[PDB]
Design an enzyme around this catalytic site. Structure first.
Site, PDB file in Angstrom:
ATOM      1  N   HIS A   1       0.876  -1.164   0.000  1.00 24.51           N
ATOM      2  CA  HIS A   1       0.000   0.000   0.000  1.00 24.51           C
ATOM      3  C   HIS A   1       0.928   1.234   0.000  1.00 24.51           C
ATOM      4  CE1 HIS A   1      -3.406   2.501   1.286  1.00 24.51           C
ATOM      5  NE2 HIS A   1      -2.444   3.226   1.838  1.00 24.51           N
TER       6      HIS A   1
ATOM      7  N   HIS B   1      -1.037   3.334  11.611  1.00 22.76           N
ATOM      8  CA  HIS B   1       0.007   4.354  11.455  1.00 22.76           C
ATOM      9  C   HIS B   1       0.157   5.264  12.679  1.00 22.76           C
ATOM     10  CE1 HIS B   1       1.496   7.791   8.555  1.00 22.76           C
ATOM     11  NE2 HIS B   1       2.510   6.940   8.747  1.00 22.76           N
TER      12      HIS B   1
ATOM     13  N   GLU C   1      -2.313  14.976  10.640  1.00 27.82           N
ATOM     14  CA  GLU C   1      -3.246  14.588   9.585  1.00 27.82           C
ATOM     15  C   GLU C   1      -4.649  15.093   9.762  1.00 27.82           C
ATOM     16  OE1 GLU C   1      -2.880  10.431   8.589  1.00 27.82           O
ATOM     17  OE2 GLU C   1      -0.753  10.385   9.153  1.00 27.82           O
TER      18      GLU C   1
ATOM     19  N   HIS D   1      -5.829  13.540  13.310  1.00 32.92           N
ATOM     20  CA  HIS D   1      -4.922  12.601  13.954  1.00 32.92           C
ATOM     21  C   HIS D   1      -3.645  13.343  14.020  1.00 32.92           C
ATOM     22  CE1 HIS D   1      -7.584   9.755  11.577  1.00 32.92           C
ATOM     23  NE2 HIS D   1      -8.067   9.727  12.818  1.00 32.92           N
TER      24      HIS D   1
ATOM     25  N   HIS E   1      -3.368   5.921  14.622  1.00 33.66           N
ATOM     26  CA  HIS E   1      -4.543   5.787  13.764  1.00 33.66           C
ATOM     27  C   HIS E   1      -4.416   4.562  12.875  1.00 33.66           C
ATOM     28  CE1 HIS E   1      -1.856   8.388  11.565  1.00 33.66           C
ATOM     29  NE2 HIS E   1      -2.533   8.211  10.430  1.00 33.66           N
TER      30      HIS E   1
HETATM   31  O1  LIG Z   1      -6.672   6.763   6.357  1.00 35.68           O
HETATM   32  C1  LIG Z   1      -5.996   7.692   6.837  1.00 35.68           C
HETATM   33  O2  LIG Z   1      -6.224   8.227   7.909  1.00 35.68           O
HETATM   34  C2  LIG Z   1      -4.808   8.277   6.074  1.00 35.68           C
HETATM   35  C3  LIG Z   1      -3.852   7.264   5.558  1.00 35.68           C
HETATM   36  C4  LIG Z   1      -3.902   7.012   4.210  1.00 35.68           C
HETATM   37  C5  LIG Z   1      -3.094   6.074   3.616  1.00 35.68           C
HETATM   38  O3  LIG Z   1      -3.217   5.861   2.334  1.00 35.68           O
HETATM   39  C6  LIG Z   1      -2.177   5.411   4.383  1.00 35.68           C
HETATM   40  C7  LIG Z   1      -2.100   5.706   5.749  1.00 35.68           C
HETATM   41  C8  LIG Z   1      -2.972   6.615   6.360  1.00 35.68           C
HETATM   42  O4  LIG Z   1      -2.859   6.843   7.702  1.00 35.68           O
HETATM   43 FE   LIG Z   2      -1.528   8.400   8.673  1.00 36.45          FE
END
Ligand SMILES: O=C(O)Cc1cc(O)ccc1O
Ligand SMILES: [Fe+3]
Ligand SMILES: O=C(O)Cc1cc(O)ccc1O
Ligand SMILES: O=C(O)Cc1cc(O)ccc1O
Ligand SMILES: O=C1C=C[C@H](O)C(CC(=O)O)=C1
Ligand SMILES: [Fe+3]
Ligand SMILES: [Fe+3]
Ligand SMILES: [Fe+3]
Lengths: 426, 426, 426, 426
Positions: free
Chosen positions: B281, B324, B330, B354, B360
């Protein structure tokens, strides 16, 4: 099996005997096991740490223990530079010669930025071998990027042993000693000889902190030393020439080492391929595995790019490579299967050279197919092509131009391209 | 229909009357048509040309012709920063208030790097409006990135008129004068107020010379001047405050102009989305549309990132965003449809925060459905999510913390994540 | 005696007559004393101020007042480059020749990066002279770094007179006119002709703001002019060749000057030598006096490093230089006494060359001595060795390869190196 | 006894279970052992590869599985900024408080560049604890440099366990979870909390490729995980505050990890100390162990410098530190014995602060002694001091200023400095 250490650019540490590496220093007065400390400076001392390549070796005898080097009669690389030729060139695969030819003896010069006597930029060869090496070699002229196509390679280097098969690549730093064993009896492949800044991982830009060639997949061998009492020939490549001397010990006598100037292998099947997930055809730079920069930011000495199994999803687009004219020089090879841009004539071991501003692109068969394609997700498979893209013009050797393999009517593959233009209908 | 000029960063030239632009110079003694030359310097004079933003205006009356500015009693951005709060935050969509509110009166402070009084970094708002502007405005505090979610805007700027709808974005340079008209009576959306280095295209790295947001798609309006002879209020946003003066002429009196400090619009549907054509990803920086750098190379002030319709082909991969923890901050919004990492609670007009090192990832349901699914090509469609990612911590406003739209149990979306760990089975 | 101005890189000002230098301007209509203003541009006009080297001259007659230059029959640098040779080389000291030989006539080409007709990088010479110059010379091919080994030199330049003796070094910028007088009747020493970026002080890194060669020690001569009527030969070195014309006046007629493109001298005895105060053997880049950079940050065109009287304190360490293999090319000279790594065969006036990846290090006898020695603080004294280290390959001339001073069995110095390896005793 | 991985900045790989790391990818759909993939991004995604710090974690439960954080009643660093004080400050060692105080409760704020609520630059603390942590902690505010002075620490981190003793330093990345166990029942030491660019090895300049803190001496722990289900408080430091939540599992549940964002330790006794081998007193920047840069090239946010056992050989030199006034701000600590510039009052655990342009230097006693001693090579031993040098002003806290340990008569250490000026005798 052979063990490896992982992580591109790491400060590695490896010992074949416990405590062989001195602890807390590089140069003790009496080194463990009565070994000799030697420094192999792959870069100038004052390079930014990020650029630094240096390895400390703890060996049986100093590399300095060698008699005068003598020029050998047998000079594979002493052939002339071919005459000026702007044409698009294509070679069929190179035959293995019947006469005994080990790894170093079998480098057929294809195209280079400069004459073998004045190494600059990149020198491209195709190796053909039918003998394993009964000698040790080091290249004073540059870093070696090896791209096997036919047969496995067991490469005994100063820092350890690595096994390399087609679909993998290997890198030997400049001045490092090595010996090539042919596991399948014969071997064929490609070489990018880098005379410039060492190959490294590309700046990922928006791709971020992950992707393409992930550093964890770059493998470096563990310490391994030999103890042969007797004559062993040590050969060096210097300004295109092979010079040799006879040693009374094996120069692969490194018991322990630590540092960053290391040989490495990488499996191309591990490439985290990035591409279009929408439309259009991304620039081939997206497939960059390794790159050699110049002092001009963004303009590489050479880029090693692959064309691997991948998903094709581009909607309402012409999926094969677009018609192209480029400042850069494009040298293409093929390891396995077939390449998406050429219907016939480009086979494993074959080669193509599209120089500076030479107009290239798909053939009429590929064009007709793509414009008529019912676009749905399609996975390209059972193939691996690559390109060595250089900034300096690649000059074919006289040998590659007089080559029975050099295709006579390569321009004919584009001859049947029709006009489809109608100004009276958008 | 409105006409537009194409090309992100171009030195454009536009004239509403033929010959209104002086040929061969910027400052003639007697400018054509009796107009006045005026320079709007968007950057310091000595910036590298690549970073230069300046526009030459040829106008009926100089901007200097204005009485002293007076502080308005109505101050939408006068509320203080919220208390320290490290929690993961989610808001439902902001309803449009009943009280008469135009575009500049309708900004609701969500989160910001600093207090409105000392502008730095980025400040984020959600605008809600039920009235077309009956006055002209300029922001002295920064560049305005506009992300419509509901309703169409007609933005009359000094350089011309541009129309923006949801799925398009618009940027207004710092200090440029404009008026917003609501085409559908009411409007809602997001604002990224950039106090730093102007937003620009990201350096593409290996993606090369094409891809992501193509420069040809960034459209700037053509010259357009107004000639209404009545009292017009001019409002300025300075140090978070609204200050105003009354003019007797229209400040949108630019008959001709030339330069690079321009308003522009971009249709998000035209984004050339790049992603994985293999596995894993990719980092969301791969979705960068625009970025504002800092003096620290590689660490942006803010990145404007999108989550558009895209092909999902990753083999034997957990396709939603991985779990993450990030140095960066974010802030997410949603223009239409539903987002990849969240099953429920995230609606168009909604927001998420976040912050630095907050844990998250995909909610429990999303996580579950991704691990057990049979993998095959899948097109994510009829959706558009985005992120304003900032290097500086985003402090939510007191109004945002006290908001009836702030969700009470956001943390519960992760509450059911199970342990699937068995140390005896790989 | 002779007076000097101090401070490496300074914007100096000197005048032989009161008020000869114009005040508040460089190009007056009527210069003081009826002199002519002349600009000597050592760098491109647009270099960053830190890199700028330019000097304004206030002279009796402009430099443009010369007839056509003619090619001389006597061409001491017209000798071809020797054959390709990777071997480690060592030359005994060079005899002074019997024929009348002035400073510019006595240059013996040792090793250079390129042929004389296409100057690039660095060219190394050992000069031998038995006559003072009765002509004025300028080198159009580069900057000259002089390293005296025997005899004092009185160097009369356009900016004044400076005297140099062994243990001092002198630099004369490219294009500057000068005349060498041998104060002791004969002279010998070394020359590094720098064809690239002008030599400058090294970036100190952690050493900080003081140390190594302190700037206050770089001495520049004061303004001094001559007014001798009659024939003066003016010689210039252009693309390796000597060309000459006859002037009716003395070209060392500069009455006043100001600027940064200046000749200078430095006493190696004032070197603030940094090293180990703990253990190990620091990289020799630590002894850098001057460096010429390339476009590649950290990779120098050349480093001028010295090996001076110094305290050796490293505990539990192999004190002499480690065994070494380098990307760089190492040319060594000797001014006084003996060098640490070589027991015998390396004398004042002698030279060694260890090219790219050539294996070097301490000779057999010093290696044996260092391992046994009882380590205590020891002051290396009564010595001064130095290195010209280059990034490009150094090709010895034909003359240097056929020289009777070329030691036939230099490789024997490492012949008796034993294996002390014991795999059963750490 | 604990296992470590070596190599500062390496791309490391560690698994507590065989095959727990996914092969050839980061994000498998079904991760080995039913573990969860989780990315810890220590830097912006777009940083240059040399600056990149990220770690992939393979965990029992995602970090996202946590309830709401609530503000704790006990707040170690909620105390106000001290008033303005340009004075030279010196503190006697800090006694351990009687109230149960674990590692995170015992941070005594000494001096910082900004308020705890607005972290920027660096914050300095002295830690005092009498209790092992019965909870897990993470700092969202900065990276932590720990400098133990009394007592051993056993630090259980997410990437595994490390043991730190006085004379060793340990770094914990921002956001990384850890638990401190006191091996001696009580512990005291210093803390530099870096809110800026992560610490890294300094550019070596002329020191070259080896020296000072060698990268091989930087040890990271091996993967280690906890299973124990039950209540556990997770605490975070965010904008100076302690916030907490209760987990029903241990958050130190990382079975496998790979990456470069790692905690590490380094033994100061391993420092390859460089200094003068001639005369004078090298700038203290020569003792840099680690540095945190700013966007201003050459001006660090902080430099961590050491004053370890070293040989003192400088001839005809005043050997202690010179009298000094600096733009930078000097905070000194002491681990063992006595420091060279101060005879009494500066004890292990003590601290001094000499702020921007405050005049400091050796005290009267050290001054006379150094001008009288017969200079011989001298080994400084049984000592270890250090400095945190910051570019931004260090404002002492109200606690440090109201502190009974603040010495009221520090200025008197210089009071006795006599005038030895004799215009009649040079
Ligand atoms: O979904 C999220 O909050 C943002 C996010 C997007 C992504 O493609 C990979 C990590 C991520 O935290
Ligand atoms: Fe993220
Ligand atoms: O097929 C080729 O010859 C090379 C090539 C590949 C690609 O993906 C785009 C352009 C291009 O010329
Ligand atoms: O003796 C040499 O040839 C030069 C040299 C000096 C040094 O300090 C380290 C290594 C080295 O090769
Ligand atoms: O070696 C040094 C030189 C100058 C400095 O002031 C310091 C700090 C000081 O001792 O307080 C150390
Ligand atoms: Fe192409
Ligand atoms: Fe060397
Ligand atoms: Fe100081």
């Amino acid at each position: 099996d052979l063990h490896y250490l992982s992580g591109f650019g790491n400060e590695f540490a490896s010992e074949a005997l416990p405590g062989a590496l001195p602890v807390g220093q590089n140069s003790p007065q009496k080194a463990p096991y009565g070994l000799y400390a030697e420094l192999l400076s792959g870069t100038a001392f004052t390079m930014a740490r990020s650029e630094l390549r240096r390895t400390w070796l703890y060996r049986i005898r100093p590399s300095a223990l060698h008699p005068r080097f003598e020029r050998l009669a047998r000079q594979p690389l002493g052939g002339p530079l071919g005459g000026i030729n702007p044409n698009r060139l294509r070679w069929s695969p190179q035959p293995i010669p019947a006469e005994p030819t080990d790894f170093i003896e079998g480098w057929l010069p294809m195209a280079a930025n400069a004459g073998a006597e004045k190494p600059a930029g990149v020198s491209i060869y195709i190796y053909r071998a039918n003998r394993s090496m009964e000698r040790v070699f080091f290249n004073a002229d540059g870093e070696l990027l090896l791209v096997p196509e036919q047969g496995r390679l067991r490469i005994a280097t100063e820092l350890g042993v690595m096994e390399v098969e087609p679909l993998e690549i290997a890198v030997i730093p400049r001045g490092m000693k090595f010996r090539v064993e042919l596991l399948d009896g014969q071997a064929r492949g490609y070489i990018a000889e880098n005379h410039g800044a060492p190959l490294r991982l590309p700046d990922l830009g928006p791709i971020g902190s992950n992707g393409l060639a992930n550093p964890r997949d770059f493998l470096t061998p563990v310490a391994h030393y030999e103890e042969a009492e007797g004559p062993v020939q040590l050969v060096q490549k210097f300004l295109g020439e092979h010079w040799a001397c006879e040693l009374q010990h094996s120069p692969l006598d490194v018991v322990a080492w630590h540092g960053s100037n290391v040989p490495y292998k990488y499996d191309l099947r591990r490439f985290n391929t990035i591409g279009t997930v929408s439309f259009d055809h991304p620039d081939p730079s997206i497939f960059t595995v390794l790159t050699s920069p110049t002092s001009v930011h963004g303009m590489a000495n050479m880029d090693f790019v692959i064309f691997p199994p991948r998903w094709m999803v581009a909607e309402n687009t012409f999926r094969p490579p677009w018609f192209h004219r480029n400042l850069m020089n494009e040298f293409m090879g093929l390891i396995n299967g077939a390449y998406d841009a050429k219907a016939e004539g480009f086979l494993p071991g074959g080669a193509s050279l599209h120089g500076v501003m030479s107009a290239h692109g798909p053939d009429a068969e590929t064009c007709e197919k793509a414009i008529a394609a019912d676009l749905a997700p399609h996975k390209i498979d059972n193939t691996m092509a690559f390109m060595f893209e250089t900034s300096q013009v690649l000059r074919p050797s006289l040998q590659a131009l007089e080559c029975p393999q050099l295709q006579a009517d390569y321009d004919s593959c584009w001859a049947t391209l029709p006009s489809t233009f109608n100004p009276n209908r958008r």
